[PDB]
Amino acid sequence: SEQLQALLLEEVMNSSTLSQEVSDLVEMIWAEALGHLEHMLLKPVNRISLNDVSKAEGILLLVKAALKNGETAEQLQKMMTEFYRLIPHKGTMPKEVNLGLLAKKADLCQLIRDMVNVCENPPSLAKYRALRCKIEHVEQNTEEFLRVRKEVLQNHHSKSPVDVLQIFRVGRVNETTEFLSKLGNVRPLLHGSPVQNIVGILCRGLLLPKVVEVGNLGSGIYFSDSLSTSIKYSHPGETDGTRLLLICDVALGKCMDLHEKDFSLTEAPPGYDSVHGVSQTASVTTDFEDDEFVVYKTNQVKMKYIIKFSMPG
Ligand SMILES: Nc1ncnc2c1ncn2[C@@H]1O[C@H](C(=O)N2CCN(CC(=O)Nc3cccc4c3CNC4=O)CC2)[C@@H](O)[C@H]1O
């Protein structure tokens, strides 16, 4: 019948037995992300609507505007208690509402939006599609795995053993086409990050830090040629106990070598496309302990791989 042939097509169209490795990765990063929310949310995430988040974000803008104008804390707290009604927290309710809090509350709202959107087609594929990002497992047999393994395990100043469990080929669609390859000097660098950030990184790529009216080369996207340095930023997840790390092609064209720190950099110096923090050496002292590479454009970045690894300790 019409209906049978519909079901038979439905079976075909709705089928993708994508690998365990990729599935387990998706399940983890989402679980780890949800683990962050559950840590500081009285109300379950399922019982928060998208309206609550939109209104919550709307209040932060009013509170931020009011804070800069120097309104009394009476008004600020009155507005903020309305925010906390929509987005309940456990622990403290900061009396001193600084600008730094509002930025983190704004981040939190986005992490809530992720978890709400995804809830909806098995529960594994719903989470994969939600990333809008094409992860593909690379087999240990292939010569691509040995290649990438060595690429990661080259600049290792520290001699701490590294258990490279899984490697995944990753790509975002719009990230590739908008990449500034024409601007030369593209080299593959590493970006460490805690596991709870990964869903957000895969969803929206690496974003520019928000200049609050912390990094020692200003508000840009940092990378390193060394693995030992990227391990420091790639913290172990509470879910699995493993570390995740990105390999990105960073188009950084003209790269100015710096010795002194500079926290006020919103974009690259005039004349250069990027910055290199030169590390402390034998007879060349610097303020940088490790080699930092910083770009201040999202379209100077293009992530290639995700590396799942773990330290002994
Ligand atoms: N879309 C996104 N969703 C969620 N988190 C996202 C994101 N885009 C970036 N991030 C995350 O924001 C964080 C961020 O901006 N930060 C925190 C880190 N800080 C200093 C810094 O980058 N230092 C630094 C220096 C040298 C190497 C490396 C790093 C970090 N990773 C490295 O390999 C600069 C500001 C960062 O940890 C990144 O992973």
Residue numbers in the entry: 242 to 361, 368 to 460, 469 to 568
Copy text from the publication.
PARP4 is an ADP-ribosyltransferase that uses NAD+ as a substrate to synthesize ADP-ribose modifications on molecules. The PARP1-homology region of PARP4 includes a BRCT fold, a WGR domain, and the catalytic (CAT) domain. However, PARP3 and PARP4 contain the catalytic triad H-Y-E but are considered MARylation enzymes, indicating that other structural features are important determinants of catalytic output.
The PARP4 catalytic domain was crystallized on its own, and in complex with the NAD+-mimic EB47 (32). The CAT/EB47 complex crystals diffracted to 2.95 Å and belong to space group P212121 with two molecules in the asymmetric unit. The refined structure has a crystallographic R/RFREE of 0.215/0.262. While building the model for the HD using the CAT/EB47 diffraction data, it was clear that the HD occupied a significantly different position relative to the ART than that observed with PARP1/2/3. In contrast to PARP1, the PARP4 HD is translated and rotated away from the ART active site, located in a position that does not appear to be an impediment to NAD+ binding. A notable difference between the PARP1 and PARP4 structures is that two helices αA and αB of PARP1 are merged into one continuous helix in PARP4 (referred to as αA/B in PARP4). The presence of the continuous helix αA/B in PARP4 is likely to hold the HD at a specific distance from the ART, essentially maintaining the catalytic region in an open state. The analogous residues in PARP4 (V286 and I289) remain in the interior of the HD fold, suggesting that PARP4 is held in an open and active conformation without requiring the major unfolding event observed in PARP1. The PARP4 catalytic domain crystal structure represents an ‘open’ conformation that is capable of binding substrate NAD+, based on the complex with the NAD+-mimic EB47 and the binding analysis with the non-hydrolyzable NAD+ analog BAD. Our analysis indicates that PARP4 achieves the ‘open’ conformation while maintaining the core fold of the HD.
